Paper text:
Human leukocyte antigen (HLA)-I molecules are of central importance in the presentation of antigenic peptides, enabling CD8+ T cells to eliminate cancerous and virally infected cells. However, HLA-I molecules can present extended peptides (>10 amino acids), whereby the N- and C-termini are similarly constrained within the HLA-I molecule, forcing the central region of the peptide to bulge from the Ag-binding cleft. NY-ESO-1 is an immunogenic cancer-testis antigen that is spontaneously expressed on a range of melanomas and other cancers including myelomas. To identify the principles underpinning extended peptide recognition, here we investigated TCR binding of an immunodominant NY-ESO-1 13-amino-acid peptide (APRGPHGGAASGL) derived from positions 60–72 of the cancer-testis antigen, NY-ESO-1.
The KFJ37-TCR bound NY-ESO-160–72-HLA-B*07:02 docking centrally atop the bulged central region of the peptide, stabilising the dynamic central portion of the NY-ESO-160–72 peptide between the Vα and Vβ domains of the KFJ37-TCR. The KFJ37 TCR and KFJ5 TCR adopted similar and canonical docking modes, binding centrally atop the pHLA-I, with a docking angle of approximately 70° across the peptide-binding groove of HLA-B*07:02, whereby the Vα and Vβ of the TCR positioned over the α2- and α1-helices, respectively. The total buried surface area (BSA) of the KFJ37 TCR-NY-ESO-160–72–HLA-B*07:02 interface was 2350 Å2, of which the TCR α- and β-chains contributed approximately equally (45% and 55%, respectively). Here, Asn31α and Tyr33α (CDR1α) projected down towards the HLA-I surface and formed hydrogen bonds to Arg62 and Trp167, and Ala158, Tyr159 and Glu163 of the HLA-I, respectively. Additionally, Asp108α (CDR3α) formed a salt bridge with Arg62 of the α1-helix. The β-chain of the KFJ37 TCR makes further ionic interactions with the HLA-I α1-helix, whereby Glu59β (CDR2β) salt bridged to the protruding Arg78. The position of the KFJ37 TCR CDR loops on the HLA-B*07:02 surface allows the TCR to completely encapsulate the protruding NY-ESO-160–72 peptide. Indeed, the central part of the peptide was sandwiched between both CDR3 loops and three-tyrosine residues from CDR1α, FWβ and CDR2β. As observed in the binary structure, the central portion of the NY-ESO-160–72 peptide arched out of the peptide-binding groove, yet here was stabilised upon KFJ37 TCR ligation. Here, P6-His made hydrogen bonding contacts with Tyr33α of the CDR1α loop and Gln55α of the FWα and also made a water-mediated contact to Ser113β of the CDR3β.
Author numbering:
A (entry chain H): 1 to 99
B (entry chain P): 1 to 13
C (entry chain D): 3 to 247
D (entry chain G): 1 to 195, 198 to 274
E (entry chain C): 5 to 200
């Protein structure tokens, strides 16, 4: 009680079109642990999204990595959608290849 | 390995 | 603490094929309860452990053995379809509270004797033997000897009482009784004890020596069909009085 | 250098939905190697690193029973905690545990840890001497008295000086080539006009997570408007980090990025 | 793992008693643990250790670096310490072996070995014979007959007189049985006083 999630969307490897990669959404710094995280492709939730095991930092705040295997594309738009008890509405963060 | 009780039952808290 | 682990009843004699339930209360503050079985000349064997109502650990426990821990943390171990080999000391232990994390607090135990029939259960005969005059002359001490004989099963508590008050000083009762008939199992048992006092104490006719044997037998609900008095849990005494001689 | 083994317990109570969820994760340094989840199909300790897989059945069996018992204990603890704070029987609360050992290059104990948080705040910690507790709270004082009577600290010390050091030793031996690993970062700089312009110092694929990225002005650091994101997991047991300065398009050949990481023989200096 | 320890040990009061335990396959999580038990009573925790020597109010526990052995050391035993001592290596379950049964004997050094007769009640069947005031090195044997009953030696403490003494009892219903030949299956001292 009660910390807001910090969100980073990024690829495991530097993104190149046609070559397979992993899409990560790292949520961290939040409390309590209950949290909803989806990965989006052109606005809709991806099915095959795994996540790491629930852990926490030295300040007791939780962190989780959600990820999925994908191949990036010029036209395709990926995002992360996060809901948590500290959020009015879901926060959507777009994957920007340069961050 | 995680901590076991060494022959009794855990603290409580 | 303040109260240690308790177990009820102290003893139990019951026919093969039957069912018994043993009761235990953990030491004050402890949330975890253990059950152990001690067969003759063996270490305790772990049966089952509960924590706060929930089963935590199992030993090599037969499915006819079944246990439970209630919200008040007391526990019940019911032994079903009893057979001869179930005859043992059943110990209860506790931890997870006031008792240290690495320790178990053991109760006094419940003794279970399983018999194929409750007919070769006999109460003891108590006999007090007066001091030897030779001993009084040679040592100025006087040893009284008690004998409790022909009882089954092996579950007696012998005590000495002098002038109405139980004594322990000068007393030695045998560690384990004798079998009155060896190899003939379901043998009755014999047990001796000794009380040594000063000759001057013994020769004083106002001193009263009672040897008492608490025996644990059948209850008043046990079906008793035979010629003999019902060998129920009872006390059998024998006594002597001071002799100036 | 130094190494640490650490366990992280999280237990969450539910309103009227049965038994709390217990989850545990184990780390050696920045590498996770075991997990346990009470809400799994069958609650079982599972491996999460290659160097722990060699452990035989008895290891996972035993550790699993430990986790189960600990889950029960955490439940009763959540009950007591609800009691101490006069919280309602319907609320959902969190109990977190954090313990383990740090050893040096000789593999002998350097420091021990064992501490608890309730609903995200420090509740009670084992002191550096490993003999007493610091209670943060009036409730934690109740816990403190209870443990002081039962001399629990001695048992925690027994673990932290005993099995903890031994197991950490065995894990460092078995996973040597990945735990005594030091992967220097792969680094590069990117730029985005807006256009004020943006410089980005990238560090990827490094281990352990500890790293320093600084943007300097002719040799004096611009912490000021360096935008520095958290070190993040790449998902392959390596980490990533980047720093950013937005500058104008003027005098850019004195913006320097400096990367320090124990896998680097010497600190790196980067420029676009 | 399992533990192997002495089946029995003898001692006189006042001595140090050292009981060693073997556990070659002690596991990393196992703690060396000792329990004491009096007959048909709940066993009691004595002491526990991992790597280093442990000393508490009741005993000491020596632990070699290998951890393959351990020694329970009782500083100065008394008759009260006659009991079974269990060595265990413990993670979750207490697995009890047979344990070492320790007998603590008195130093009887005012020995006055004798055999006395006792006649009540009434009278006198059986007649009880009492072999007493012998020293603790003397051993008492079962009779060659089994119509004749012989007790093992028994230590009584007349605390009012600071006097400890050994005793055995033998009785039979037989006409044939007499005190003078009751215990002559045991190596009986020829100092033994036979009255009458």
């Amino acid at each position: 009680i009660q910390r807001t999630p910090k969100i980073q969307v990024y690829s495991r490897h530097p993104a190149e079109n046609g070559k397979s990669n992993f899409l990560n959404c790292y949520v961290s710094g939040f409390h309590p642990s209950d949290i909803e995280v989806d990965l989006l492709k052109n606005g809709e939730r991806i099915e095959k999204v795994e996540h790491s095991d629930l852990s926490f930092s030295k300040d007791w705040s939780f962190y989780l990595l959600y990820y999925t295997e994908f191949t990036p594309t010029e036209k395709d738009e990926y995002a992360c959608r996060v809901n948590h008890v500290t959020l009015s509405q879901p926060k959507i963060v777009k994957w920007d290849r340069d961050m | 390995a995680p901590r076991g009780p060494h022959g009794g039952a855990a603290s409580g808290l | 603490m303040d109260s240690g682990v308790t177990q009820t009843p102290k003893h139990l004699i019951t026919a093969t094929g039957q069912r018994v339930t043993l009761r235990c209360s953990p030491r004050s503050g402890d949330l975890s309860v253990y059950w152990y079985q001690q067969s003759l000349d063996q270490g305790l064997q772990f049966l089952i452990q509960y924590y706060n109502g929930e089963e935590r650990a199992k030993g090599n426990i037969l499915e006819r053995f079944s246990a439970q821990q209630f919200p008040d943390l007391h526990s019940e171990l019911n032994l079903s379809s009893l057979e001869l080999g179930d005859s043992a000391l059943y110990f209860c232990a506790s931890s997870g509270g006031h008792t240290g994390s690495n320790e178990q607090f053991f109760g006094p135990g419940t003794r279970l004797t399983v018999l194929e029939d409750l007919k070769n259960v006999f109460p003891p005969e108590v006999a007090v033997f007066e001091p030897s005059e030779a001993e009084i002359s040679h040592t100025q001490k006087a040893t009284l000897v008690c004998l409790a004989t022909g009882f089954y099963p092996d579950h007696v508590e012998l005590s000495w009482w002098v002038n109405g008050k139980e004594v322990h000083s000068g007393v030695c009762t045998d560690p384990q009784p004798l079998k009155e008939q060896p190899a003939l199992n379901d043998s009755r048992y014999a047990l001796s004890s000794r009380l040594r006092v000063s000759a001057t104490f013994w020769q004083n006719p106002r001193n009263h020596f009672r040897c008492q044997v608490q025996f644990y037998g059948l209850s008043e609900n046990d079906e008793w069909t035979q010629d003999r008095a019902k060998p129920v849990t009872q006390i059998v005494s024998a006594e002597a009085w001071g002799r100036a001689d | 250098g130094s190494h640490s083994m650490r366990y992280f317990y999280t237990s969450v109570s539910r309103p009227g939905r049965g038994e709390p969820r217990f989850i545990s994760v184990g780390y050696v340094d920045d590498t996770q190697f075991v997990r346990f989840d009470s809400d799994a199909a069958s609650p079982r300790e599972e491996p999460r690193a290659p160097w722990i897989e060699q452990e035989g059945p008895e290891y996972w069996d035993r550790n699993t029973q430990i986790y189960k018992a600990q889950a029960q204990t955490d439940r009763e603890s959540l009950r007591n905690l609800r009691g101490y704070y006069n919280q309602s029987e319907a609320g959902s609360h969190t109990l977190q545990s954090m313990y383990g050992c740090d050893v040096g290059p000789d593999g002998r104990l350097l420091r021990g840890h064992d501490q608890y948080a309730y609903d995200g705040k420090d509740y009670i910690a084992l002191n550096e001497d490993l003999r007493s507790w610091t209670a943060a709270d009036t409730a934690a004082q109740i816990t403190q008295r209870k443990w002081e009577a039962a001399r629990e600290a001695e048992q925690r010390r027994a673990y932290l000086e005993g099995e903890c050091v031994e197991w950490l030793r065995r894990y460092l031996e078995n996973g040597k080539d990945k735990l005594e690993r030091a992967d220097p970062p792969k680094t590069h700089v990117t730029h985005h006009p807006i256009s004020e312009a943006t410089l980005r110092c990238w560090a990827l694929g490094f281990y352990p997570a500890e790293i320093t990225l600084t943007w300097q002005r002719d040799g004096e650091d611009q912490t000021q408007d360096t935008e520095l994101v958290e070190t993040r997991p790449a998902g392959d047991r390596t980490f990533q980090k980047w720093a950013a300065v937005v500058v104008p398009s003027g005098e850019e050949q004195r913006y320097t990025c400096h990367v320090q990481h124990e896998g680097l023989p010497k600190p790196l200096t980067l420029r676009w | 793992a399992k533990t192997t320890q002495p089946i029995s040990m003898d001692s006189y009061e006042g001595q140090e008693v050292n009981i060693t335990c073997s556990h070659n396959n002690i596991a990393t999580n196992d703690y060396i643990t000792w329990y004491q038990q009096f007959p048909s009573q709940g066993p009691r925790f004595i002491i526990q250790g991992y790597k280093t020597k442990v000393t508490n109010e009741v005993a000491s526990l020596f632990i070699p670096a290998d951890r393959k052995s351990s020694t329970l050391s009782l500083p100065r035993v008394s008759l009260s310490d006659t009991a079974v001592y269990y060595c265990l290596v413990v993670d979750q379950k207490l697995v009890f072996g047979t344990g070492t049964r320790l007998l603590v004997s008195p130093n009887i050094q005012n020995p006055d070995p004798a055999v006395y007769q006792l006649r009540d009640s009434k009278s006198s069947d059986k007649s009880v014979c009492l072999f007493t005031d012998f020293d603790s090195q003397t051993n008492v044997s079962q009779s060659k007959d089994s119509d004749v009953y012989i007790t093992d030696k028994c230590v009584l403490d007349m605390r009012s007189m600071d006097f400890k003494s050994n005793s055995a009892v033998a009785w039979s219903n037989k006409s044939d049985f007499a005190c003078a030949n009751a215990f002559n299956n045991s190596i009986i001292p020829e100092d033994t006083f036979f009255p009458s």
